[PDB]
Amino acid sequence: MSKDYQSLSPFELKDELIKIASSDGNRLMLNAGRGNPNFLATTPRRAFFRLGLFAAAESELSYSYMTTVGVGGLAKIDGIEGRFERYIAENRDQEGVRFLGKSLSYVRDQLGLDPAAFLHEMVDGILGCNYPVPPRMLNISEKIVRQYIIREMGADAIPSESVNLFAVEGGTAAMAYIFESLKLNGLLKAGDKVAIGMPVFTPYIEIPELAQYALEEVAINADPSLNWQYPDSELDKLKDPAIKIFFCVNPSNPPSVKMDQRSLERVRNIVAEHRPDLMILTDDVYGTFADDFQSLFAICPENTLLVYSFSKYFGATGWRLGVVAAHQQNVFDLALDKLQESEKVALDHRYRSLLPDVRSLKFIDRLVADSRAVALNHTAGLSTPQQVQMALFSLFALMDEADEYKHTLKQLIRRRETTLYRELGMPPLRDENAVDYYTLIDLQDVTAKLYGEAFSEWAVKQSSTGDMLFRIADETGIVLLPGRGFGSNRPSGRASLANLNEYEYAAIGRALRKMADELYAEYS
């Protein structure tokens, strides 16, 4: 397939290169531009499996008949704290159990929630024996996860009670649901313009283009000379009232830098002074990998729909865990109040089965209903075991006051960067906005640092992206994404610093150094 990559003829060369890839991880980058982590948070997963064993015993205590097979009943909330405290006490030597005991203290003692309700939500939830209720998100899991979201998005000033979440099957489901609900509710109409922060991976460029949404894309271009920050002139394009929504991945993918303070402030001022109606849709999956991250959701909560995925930070791509966050008073609901009477009446009919007064149905709840064709709203929602795992990842981050996990992953990314660039003039100079979950390996910069500016200009002209990607693939079996495009004046390639082990980054550096040495030998 290779959609992201493609986005003796030159075409067939590209096809041959794609065929070299041999791992699911390499193919995921070529097809969809995502780096699947090869690390994962184990403590909250062990806590999840240990909670399940406790829950299985709680279920068997509720089965009343002598049975030859394993059948259980529903766990009881009465007496649950004491039974859970016995389980904790009998298993102090099991890491997952110790984590569960601390998480109960955090929720009961720091969040101030009902301990038996928490334990029962977690036990019944991990048994997966009841439909999610309410469908938008389990009650205590929502309060736990939103504390995590607010902290990592740098949105401390927003009172936590003003934030609501819809738990979904990763950012992948969130985007599918959000675009469908914006169309269904007349918030995005045929011909409307969608401003997109670019560069961005292909799936997000593609969604608005679907014929089912007659949308026009307007590029808000990141500037390489500014280390991929969006210049004020680009951000100012958001002033055109024709742009109904600003769609952004922050930290970005592929550049992998977070928006700096100047950029965030610019957007905040454009919104307060010129576009109080602007809808913002931001995907902040990489936030925790940045230093002192602050989301567009923290800056303009009333105008932003935040999409947060747990996939990359917790190494949970296969768990499909995400949330859509909205402030209680937002521009989407303001926009719904402004629809023409004809659209409002059609929506009264569409959601009539949900509640008496549809005009009072908030957009975040329309997302839930639309995700399952409305009529099935009562059985909608993310599975309860998924919500439980999501809550345990959240508690793991929240209870780690010194951010040990976050520091561990950031040092791992830097260690890999050093290994990759060792033989290429060392890692590129970083700054406070660098995230580097993805890295751009530029031929001009590498050859310059190694043999000087003059050799480098002769080198890029002598070479090509295709040449570079082929030499690396042929020697290591790893196919990098084209950094700029096969026709570029500056041959470059991109790799994720999350999906390979050190000797593979070393091999890539060695293949590239070798190519640089042979070019210089010729230039000698």
Q: By the criterion CB under 5 A, which residues form the site for Cl ion?
A: 46, 94-96
Query: Which among 56, 87, 84, 83 has a CA at the least distance from the CA of 72?
Result: 56
Is the torsion defined by CA of 197, 203, 209, 210 positive or negative?
negative
Q: Gaps after which residues in the chain, C–N over 2.5 Å?
A: 7
Instruction: Tell me how many residues contact ligand PLP (CB under 6 A).
Output: 15
Binding its own copies by CB under 8 A: which of 317, 394, 447, 496?
317
Structure tokens at 295: 């989301």
Phi, psi for 295 (deg, rounded to 5):
-80, 155
CB of residue 20 to its own copies, shortest distance in Å:
19
154-183 positions binding ligand PLP, by CB under 6 A? 170-172
502 near its own copies (CB under 8 A):
yes
494 annotated to bind ligand: yes
Structure tokens at 349: 């009919």
* Residue 468, C-beta contacts closer than 8 angstroms, at least 6 positions apart: 443, 491, 492, 493, 512, 515
Site string for ligand PLP, 302-331 (x = CB under 6 A): -------x-xx----x----x---------
Spacing of C-alpha 161 from chain mean position: 23
Q: What whole-number distance in Å separates Cα of residue 233 and Cα of residue 212? A: 31
256 near ligand PLP (CB under 6 A):
no
Under DSSP, the state recorded for 93 is: T
73 annotated to bind ligand: no
Cβ–Cβ contacts within 10 Å for residue 82, how many? 10
* Residue 266, C-beta contacts closer than 8 angstroms, at least 6 positions apart: 232, 235, 236
Pick what 322 binds: its own copies, Cl ion, ligand PLP, none; C-beta below 5 to 8 Å, kind-dependent: ligand PLP
Pick what 283 binds: its own copies, ligand PLP, Cl ion, none; C-beta below 5 to 8 Å, kind-dependent: ligand PLP
81 near its own copies (CB under 8 A):
yes
379 near ligand PLP (CB under 6 A):
yes
Which residue, 419 or 496, is less far from ligand PLP as judged by CB?
496
CB of residue 171 to ligand PLP, shortest distance in Å:
3
Q: What whole-number distance in Å separates Cα of residue 11 and Cα of residue 56? A: 56
18 near its own copies (CB under 8 A):
no
Q: What whole-number distance in Å separates Cα of residue 337 and Cα of residue 343? A: 10
Which residue, 483 or 491, is less far from ligand PLP as judged by CB?
483
CB of residue 457 to its own copies, shortest distance in Å:
23
Which residue, 45 or 320, is less far from Cl ion as judged by CB?
45
107 near ligand PLP (CB under 6 A):
no
112 annotated to bind ligand: yes
Binding its own copies by CB under 8 A: which of 345, 407, 474, 489?
407
Binding its own copies by CB under 8 A: which of 316, 331, 435, 473?
316
Q: What whole-number distance in Å separates Cα of residue 256 and Cα of residue 234? A: 18
Under DSSP, the state recorded for 290 is: S
Q: List binding-site positions.
A: 112, 253, 494
> Which residues would be at the binding site for ligand PLP (CB under 6 A)?
34, 170-172, 201, 249, 253, 283, 285, 309, 311-312, 317, 322, 379
